[PDB]
Amino acid sequence: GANKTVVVTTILESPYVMMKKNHEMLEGNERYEGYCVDLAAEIAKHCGFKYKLTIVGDGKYGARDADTKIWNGMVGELVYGKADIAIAPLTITLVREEVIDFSKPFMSLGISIMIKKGTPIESAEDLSKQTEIAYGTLDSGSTKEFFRRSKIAVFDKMWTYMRSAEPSVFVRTTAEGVARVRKSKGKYAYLLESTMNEYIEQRKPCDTMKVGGNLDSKGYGIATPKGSSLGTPVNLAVLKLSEQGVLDKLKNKWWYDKGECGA
């Protein structure tokens, strides 16, 4: 029928969406800034709709409970129809693609290792063959799933360790994993997406480092409930933005341009 204001679910995750420092003196979409804020603006213009940014209530990306089969996070919000579109760093996975539609990816990533600077680790293989340095992942996300489902020897080795490690090596938010890297004096490494890894690397206090190659090749896509009218228009808009250079321009804006660790 007649066009509705589109409800957008997203996640507070640097540099994609952040509360502006002065958010309290602002209302609506103006409260927020970052790569996915800007991308929301572009997609909305190109598909000709009005929208409201809403941070995902539980603060999670999206995972199905093995028992209940209930989806949580931003995926949950699409699945149960609380939100019309998710515009966030949400990784295209098989388990998600079956319950929600994904645009072609708007940004690439792969799983990667953050160390505190000077940590004697260069790779995942290094992590797997030692125990002095603890390591983990975000909860409720594609990185955790990757390790749990991996048949590859080293990642299976890593997963068997991580699932049973005491204290827990898993974290609620990316900012928590980073905090743990920075405070653990080289005795914690964090497994996170290269995109986030690279952003943080170029942020004060400039004490972290991405090491080794990526463990996989995947992408973020814009997600809509299965069969939503927004799917096709959103997918075309992503490819047009790609082809206009907008995505690279936005990547430059929120990564390189934000760099505060020198050249």
Ligand X SMILES: N[C@@H](CCC(=O)O)C(=O)O
**Residue 23 C-beta: closest distance to ligand 808, Å:** 30
Does position 216 interact with its own copies (CB under 8 A)? The reply is yes
Candidate residues 90, 158, 215, 246; the one interacting with ligand X per rule CB under 6 A: 90
Cβ-based neighbours of 131, under 8 Å, separated by 6 or more? 161
Q: Using the minimum distance from each CB to ligand X, give the nearer residue, 49 or 188.
A: 188
Within residues 101-160, the interface with its own copies by CB under 8 A covers 102, 104-105, 108, 146, 149, 151-152
Query: Is the separation of the CB atoms in 107 and 193 below 8 Å?
Result: no
Query: Is the separation of the CB atoms in 122 and 156 below 8 Å?
Result: no
3-state SS class at 114: strand
Candidate residues 57, 59, 186, 219; the one interacting with ligand 808 per rule CB under 6 A: 219
DSSP type of residue 218: E
Does position 242 interact with ligand 808 (CB under 6 A)? The reply is yes
Tell me which H or E stretch contains 247: helix 246-254
d(CA 239, CA 218): 17
Query: Residues 75-94: x/- map of binding to ligand 808 (CB under 6 A)?
Result: -----------------x--
Does position 240 interact with its own copies (CB under 8 A)? The reply is yes
Burial letters 93-121, b for 16+ CB under 10 A, else e? beebeebbbbbebbbebbbbbbbbeebeb
Candidate residues 141, 221, 225, 231; the one interacting with ligand X per rule CB under 6 A: 141
Does position 138 interact with ligand X (CB under 6 A)? The reply is yes
Does position 239 interact with ligand 808 (CB under 6 A)? The reply is yes
Say how many residues touch its own copies, by CB under 8 A.
Answer: 28
Within 13 A of 78's CA, how many CA atoms are on the CB side?
32
Count of CB atoms situated within 10 Å of the CB of 263? 4
Residue 192 interacts with which of ligand 808, its own copies, ligand X, none, CB < 5 to 8 Å by class: ligand X
d(CA 199, CA 3): 37
Does position 233 interact with ligand 808 (CB under 6 A)? The reply is no
* Window of 25-33, 137-145, 165-173, 228-236 that interacts with ligand X by CB under 6 A: 137-145
Which residues sit at the interface with its own copies, rule CB under 8 A?
92-94, 97-98, 102, 104-105, 108, 146, 149, 151-152, 216-219, 221, 235-236, 239-240, 242-245, 247-248
